[PDB]
Amino acid sequence: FLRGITPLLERWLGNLLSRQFEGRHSKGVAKTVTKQRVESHFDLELRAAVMHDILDMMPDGIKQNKARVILQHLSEAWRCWKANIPWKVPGLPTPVENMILRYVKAKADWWTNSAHYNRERVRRGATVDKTVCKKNLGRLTRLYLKSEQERQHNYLKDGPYISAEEAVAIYTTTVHWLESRRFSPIPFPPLSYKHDTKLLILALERLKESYSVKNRLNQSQREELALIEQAYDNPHEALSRIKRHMLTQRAFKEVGIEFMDLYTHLIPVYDIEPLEKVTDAYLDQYLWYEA
Amino acid sequence: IKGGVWKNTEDEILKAAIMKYGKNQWSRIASLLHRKSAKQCKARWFEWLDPGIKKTEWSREEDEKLLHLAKLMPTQWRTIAPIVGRTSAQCLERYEHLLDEAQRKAEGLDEEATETRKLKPGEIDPTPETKPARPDPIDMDDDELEMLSEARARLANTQGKKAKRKARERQLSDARRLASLQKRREMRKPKRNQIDYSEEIPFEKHVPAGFHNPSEDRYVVE
Amino acid sequence: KLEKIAEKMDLTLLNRLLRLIVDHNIADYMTSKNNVLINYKDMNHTNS
């Protein structure tokens, strides 16, 4: 042991002594780039390359202060890519714009390609850092929606992917089925239906159970609990609202989306507005009972 | 409790907040108001308060597209809406209003305009963001004056925690500084980590030699 | 696996099928409720 530890300590105690006598010269030693520091270092070298392209591209005789504004346009062009907003600056010079667009696509490609690489680590199990997983889920959530917005736009542009032939084929098929089954179609919940408060109470407990399993509550969860308690205290008022919604509204508040991070595959999760969930939950209960 | 009906004071606080904090940080906006959530402030903007939301009267090409789309896209009121260029609430209540005209025209259209459908029954709106605000009352009260005062304050309180706290050392000391300088004025610390720049010319770059003898210049000090 | 069933079902076709088995006011509520603004973070689009 001492054979090999002798030169190691000779070096180490030398370094200890030398900084103890000479002082520590180490100001301006090159800091290397490591795990957390990569993403800030990419932004340094991007902005430096962008700036060098700006100054070479502008002709001789221009006030250079314009260059720092161009770096702002770059940052906005990235955020619009990230958030899938279409970016267009109306007066921006076309060499400046075309230069910006290239760097945004380089940042883009690096950003998505690192999302893919990190997810293979999370699938394989080569990473155990919760911040990397939580970061990467954010990237993949954006990359999903970025393609889902394409898919929803393409539908209106490309039209119904199902032909009118196929659609009438499946429609008539269910008529011939349900006719031969003598299926009596589900009526609208009568104004004095015998079962309503039981189906409602079943709906409420399916909603309330999701909060027994949680230690903390926030403003959207609190308002749901208030609605559940109000529905318990005056169910004939709750049922009056619920039935009125199905007759008299067709425009609904926006649905938030989130993803649930099972390491092999993400599941999409939606939060419907609490006042609407109580109506869907009764209807869900009503539909399945009647069916 | 959240939301309620909108008040004209709230809409203009929202306008001021939007035209400062920017059109997509609604939580920073909603903490300026009471009663509303960020989602309700966001909804209030795009669904009715935003400029360009086309609150002019409807016209027969709009109605044609509305009735054309309502056949092609039954119930898809968020997809119909871009194509008519109107908000989904406008599309739907117009469509319902046009059916109300078409349904009363079955028979007794004059009394059938009047004896029921003249107004909603006074139930709470499921989204009053779609509706014009209540005008502000003839005089203000605590629920509005407080948020107005807090709104007015925050709208230019742009100093951060660091700047707000430590800049106070100027005012709290400088009077006392002049008073402690007043001891110097009336009773009458070492530094060594750096050169005193007033002792000798720092890092003096001497002027190069040139063809004109500089010592012919005689300068008189000010 | 009947892949992408929920992703690909056309709401106009779904509505017509729902019109068969249930009252049209419910079937119109159901399909309209599928047709709503999706939101995450600063990203928004209509589910069509």
Binding site: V175, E179 | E64 | -
Partner: peptide
């Protein structure tokens, strides 16, 4: 537009095909 309003109310607010009953008539638009 009232012609097509009356036309599509025969398409929308009818009871279901599985009930039978006579079709509402429509108009040529």
């Amino acid at each position: 537009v009232q012609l097509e309003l009356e036309n599509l109310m025969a398409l929308q607010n009818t009871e279901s095909a599985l009930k039978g009953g006579l079709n509402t008539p429509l108009h040529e638009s």
